Design a protein around this ligand. Structure first.
Ligand SMILES: Cn1c(N)nc2ccccc21
Ligand SMILES: Cn1c(N)nc2ccccc21
Ligand SMILES: Cn1c(N)nc2ccccc21
Ligand SMILES: [Cl-]
Ligand SMILES: [Cl-]
Ligand SMILES: [Cl-]
Length: 163
């Protein structure tokens, strides 16, 4: 575990993280995909061997000794708000189990279902709160990655609010 488990946010490519493992915002079929998923494919292509896994689950595949936790959030284009919300909460609970099993002291995480799977809606608060619900009981240092300068501010504010 980390000595004083924390949350942090960084606005940068998650493929250049400084943590002991990465969560991929995966598709169910283990395809190279777009956005975060394509950056993870470029950096850790070996981790996409048998990475396909259903919506609401996480599957870890090693790239060398570096763990890539493929977490499949729902595509809100296909899911109802209600069923989508349930699967998004579940994907994060499966991430917390994997981070715990691996015994890592740190993890790089994106906000699941906030990219092309958002169905166009702003889901910062919805996705971040499910991230907290899952990860609050883990003792890994969590480093949340985003692209948008204003999302970085909003995520930083939400972390500091609890401190
Ligand atoms: C959440 N997310 C994913 N998964 N891919 C992205 C690309 C750009 C911005 C945000 C993104
Ligand atoms: C930055 N950002 C992401 N990642 N998804 C969004 C949806 C609406 C507005 C802004 C959004
Ligand atoms: C496109 N993209 C990469 N490459 N890393 C990201 C982290 C968060 C959101 C979007 C991201
Ligand atoms: Cl960057
Ligand atoms: Cl997404
Ligand atoms: Cl973003």
């Amino acid at each position: 575990g980390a000595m004083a488990p924390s949350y942090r946010v960084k606005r940068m490519d998650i493929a250049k993280n400084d943590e002991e493992c990465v969560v991929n915002a995966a598709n169910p079929r283990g395809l190279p995909g777009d956005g975060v998923c394509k950056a993870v494919y470029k950096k850790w292509p070996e981790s996409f061997k048998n990475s396909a896994t259903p919506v609401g689950t996480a599957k870890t595949v090693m790239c060398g000794t570096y763990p890539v936790i493929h977490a499949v959030g729902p595509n809100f284009s296909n899911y109802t708000e209600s069923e989508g919300d349930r699967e998004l909460a579940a994907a994060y609970r499966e991430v917390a189990k994997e981070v715990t099993r691996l015994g890592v002291n740190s993890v790089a995480i994106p906000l699941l279902s906030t990219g092309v799977y958002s169905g166009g809606k702003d889901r910062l608060t919805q996705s971040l709160n499910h991230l907290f619900t899952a990860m609050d009981s883990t003792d890994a240092d969590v480093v949340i990655y985003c692209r948008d300068k204003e999302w970085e501010k909003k995520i930083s504010e939400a972390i500091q609010m609890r401190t």
